[PDB]
Amino acid sequence: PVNPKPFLKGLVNHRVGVKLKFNSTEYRGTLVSTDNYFNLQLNEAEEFVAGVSHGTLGEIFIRCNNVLYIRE
Amino acid sequence: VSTPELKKYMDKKILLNINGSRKVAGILRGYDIFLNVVLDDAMEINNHQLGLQTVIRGNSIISLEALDA
Amino acid sequence: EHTIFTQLKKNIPKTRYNRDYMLSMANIPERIINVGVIGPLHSGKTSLMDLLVIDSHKRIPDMSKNVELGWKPLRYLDNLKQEIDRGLSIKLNGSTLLCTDLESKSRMINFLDAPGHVNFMDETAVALAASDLVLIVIDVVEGVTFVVEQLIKQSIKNNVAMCFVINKLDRLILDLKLPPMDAYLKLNHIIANINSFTKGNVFSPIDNNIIFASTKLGFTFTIKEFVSYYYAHSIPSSKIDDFTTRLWGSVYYHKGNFRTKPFENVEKYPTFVEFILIPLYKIFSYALSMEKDKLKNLLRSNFRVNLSQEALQYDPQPFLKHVLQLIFRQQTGLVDAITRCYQPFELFDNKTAHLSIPGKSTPEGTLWAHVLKTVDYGGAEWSLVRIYSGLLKRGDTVRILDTSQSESRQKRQLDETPSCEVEEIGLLGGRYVYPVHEAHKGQIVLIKGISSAYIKSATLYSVKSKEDMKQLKFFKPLDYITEAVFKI
Amino acid sequence: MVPPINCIFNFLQQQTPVTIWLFEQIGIRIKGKIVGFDEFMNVVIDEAVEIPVNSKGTPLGKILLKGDNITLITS
Amino acid sequence: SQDDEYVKDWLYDSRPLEEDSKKVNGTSYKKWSFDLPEMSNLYRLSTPLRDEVTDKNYYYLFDKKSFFNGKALNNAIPGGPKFEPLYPFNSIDRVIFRVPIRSEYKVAFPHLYNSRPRSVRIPWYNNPVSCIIQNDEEYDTPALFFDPSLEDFAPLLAEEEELILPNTKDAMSLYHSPFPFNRTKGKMVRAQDVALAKKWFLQHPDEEYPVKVKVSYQKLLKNYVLNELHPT
Amino acid sequence: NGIPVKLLNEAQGHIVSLELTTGATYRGKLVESEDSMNVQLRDVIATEPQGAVTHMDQIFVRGSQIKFIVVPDLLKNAPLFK
Amino acid sequence: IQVAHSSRLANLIDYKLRVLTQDGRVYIGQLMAFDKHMNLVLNECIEERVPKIKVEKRVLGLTILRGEQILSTVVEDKPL
Amino acid sequence: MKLVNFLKKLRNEQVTIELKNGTTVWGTLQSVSPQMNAILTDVKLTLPSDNIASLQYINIRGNTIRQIILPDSLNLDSLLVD
Amino acid sequence: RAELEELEEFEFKHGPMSLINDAMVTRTPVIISLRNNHKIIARVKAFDRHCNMVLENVKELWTEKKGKNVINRERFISKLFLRGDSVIVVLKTP
Amino acid sequence: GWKLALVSKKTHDMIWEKLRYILQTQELSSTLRESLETLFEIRQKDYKS
């Protein structure tokens, strides 16, 4: 019963960590909203370059195609 | 909509070429329109098996070769 | 010169496609369908064949003015003096036609317009023995009479693919003048009968088994064909299959954009009637009665069809025929129906086994071929032979066995004594033997040198090893469905 | 015959030891158990673990991984 | 001026259409090309003299070929002609006269039933005609026969509510007609060259005329066959 | 419908070559083709990108991976174009 | 090199066309058929790779080029 | 809502372009397809520290086009509205 | 076609597509990371489903790095069209 | 039936139409079906006796 899209709807207004494919970097910020495309938006997103916060990017909008995985 | 005719290759072992020069041996269990191969897992390239029953994604397929005639 | 006639010339009527291409195509199996069209007396099967041929070739000499117009049918596949004067197809005068399917593909077909009259069924039997698919053809009017049923039974017993042609709709629309719902009902009844006879596979317009033809007016279609032509603009790419599936089999459009299976309040008719049959009615009714300008406009608009300024001044039948041709572009839907139907080539094994014996080690490369029947196709002695393995070349020596000596041979096996050359090879094409050097596997060709080596229905072979010979098998004598009991 | 949708419905109800390989990626694998399923190949995985390849058990938890970059599954 | 609404104005003219530049070639008066309804009118008017036999089967063992065969074997089909003969085992002990072998057969399958044929043609052989003709005041109806046991788009030729036009009831009839009316264009022929009478005696004699008239019919057929036979 | 994909399916049966995104060429009798070029071959030589030839009986390929397909000179003639 | 100021690709069909590819090669030849997905059918296709010095050259004849693996199209020469 | 409307409305303008590898392209917007395929006449190319390679005509694939540098005299808000 | 554009603008305002839509409305400079490494400082003009975006006041930032010589390079453009796939993460600078 | 044809023909035609409509588009009783068939056969002559 615990599917991805309903857990993602529960993951709205919650802290999330985004990983990507090529020329890529981990993140850590409070998820704002999502859609069927899985376009993301975070507030206080910290650019964890291989688990090392290079810069506090803050208000950001991540593209869907470059997403690899999303975690706590 | 065009169903890839794998019923010739159903219930036969196949050498699946997949992303990054990786190979998959295994007898075929089923498939879908995206070419996602449902297959009984076998030894992955000396050689070693991961898993019992596997489902390979179509996008990751390079090819699939007839091991059994 | 001669009376009992063919072409006998260098200049055979030129084809739209080129015969070099056709022969190239015929290099490989899985791309040579042997159709052997079949049916009752005056099914229209010969007329259907003629339509196909005409569609294929540019200008034929024999295609006179009147036949072109469509008063007389250009019976192109009754070459015999007799077969003309008598009004019956009598011997196998098939053709090799590089036929385009509805989906873009080019397959050379070996048609065989066999006889329909039930005394000649002997000849027909050969076609069944020859052909891997069979276009059975049926008159709507007479429906499926006993003869058709018998044919069906033979085909199923002879292990051959079946793909039906409900022919001569012109009759029920103009002769019987049936209302469209009535016509639909009739069709259903027919197809019901067919289904009853064919216990195995169930035929229908859906799956492209049935073909709706009128060879006098000169048009065939599968629903798939027609739909493709005239219901691709309107409905989207993916939902077309669904539409096709719907059309036939009691579903009513209901005045609305997604039909119901049961009864509908506003309109009366089914989808098949509303979306095919009714259009045909409109065409016919208008292609006679409608003021020509109006008709031209309608054609321009809905079908996307431009009438020739000559065609405006045609007589009402030939005009109608022309219009029909313009509408249903070719005999392409028919070909699609065939190909789709005979997408099984695992049936080949069943066929061969049925004919000769259940065996194996046949694809070793030893050329062998069922000598079907001696014909007199260009006047001279020819032997119509269907090749299964290998390939035969012109000026090659061959072992031949009359199927009198078949069972005996089989018994003896568990010293290739008879032998003959192959003087020339060619291809039947209605009225001409088109000479070709190659004679590849899975096809039908005509050969000179065989004939005198046997009486009727021989086998041939040419082993490169005694071991290979041991592995061979030999066709049984063709059980010609009718037994000859008229003693003169 | 078993389409991928039906085999993943077995992986959904079972929740048996899954091992995931990743798209455009040889350096890392995953090891967990299937918990979710989308109409796309998106699947959420609880008890997932990041497992670098045999050329160790590195830390990872429950993850909604975007399923368009999947390679292997085996429960 | 209602049923005969189109032809009435010109049907009685020296040259039926001197001008009418659309409907004929011109004043040379070589070719013609009528519209449908006038053709219908002509057809209706011609009811007395018109061929009036659509079932082409009907002339069975009564074609020119059949007549020729009858000639060539002296096996005169009694409705038709009888000629001067073309020329000047099989024992009773042997054969079995179960079918009394008739002359009608001797021309049907001439090479088989009639042994020792000479100069014999091959006749036709044919399909069964069910051209159901309508009486009056209706269209598209099973009458003479019995019935079977059991994204926002419209179909083709939409906004054409009436299936049948007012002329198509007649057009169908016209379509089934024979060579004179069959068609809506032709070349002229000389009044002379039109055979209003050939179609009566070529088709079969109606019913129980006096012997003399029957003889006349036969005579006519004899002439016709001769004309057909020695192409000049 | 795709007029190049039309040609491919019409080319079934002939000895056709095939190189992928990987750069590994192939050559043999074609068997099957579809809208997405889900290609099958028989008697296929399989030269790797280095040049290492490996003869094999059959192969199936996915259309996304295909780069270009060597058709013979017969399809130049007829009948797809006009 | 000369060519007409053409509107679209299909209007200049059967022209000798230099066609780039994503893997580094360029296929040069007269185009017979195009597609919605830019699949191309070159009549006299010629395989020209750029190795890491001077051009590599090879003749193909009639070949299908898949659209996804194309970079761009350029007109090389006229028909005939 | 479609920028394809705007890009269709961009016609006969001399523009620079970047690609996936990063190749420059100076030429007149002959036309643009609904899937971004930039048909260009009178074109000039330069690779990514590399010398000139000018050409007569180029229609480039839409997906290969990275980023189109637009000209100077350009009202964006004029074309955006219907 | 109209109902899809209605639910498009509806789903933008509620979903995460509202962010850079609101950035276009506020008309501020925004940084965007790219697939081939280019931090694009620019004024957003246009905005669609696919995240293709015409950019005014353009200022691309990158490093053409080859020869052990770090040469952080950057250029100004008047107006430029962005393709969607190139984008990785868009962000509105406070 | 013949009398019906004779004077009240529209109704007769209607009757036929309904009958047929019943005949073929119905889960109809077998004896009834046979009776109907008989009716149509007689219709073909329209009551000789």
Ligand SMILES: Nc1nc2c(ncn2[C@@H]2O[C@H](COP(=O)(O)OP(=O)(O)OP(=O)(O)O)[C@@H](O)[C@H]2O)c(=O)[nH]1
């Ligand atoms: N009304 C009508 N008559 C047709 C149609 N097709 C054929 N016929 C007629 O019926 C005959 C059947 O076609 P043919 O090809 O001559 O007969 P056949 O198929 O050779 O019959 P066999 O000699 O037994 O093979 C023709 O001679 C026509 O007169 C049709 O579509 N409508």
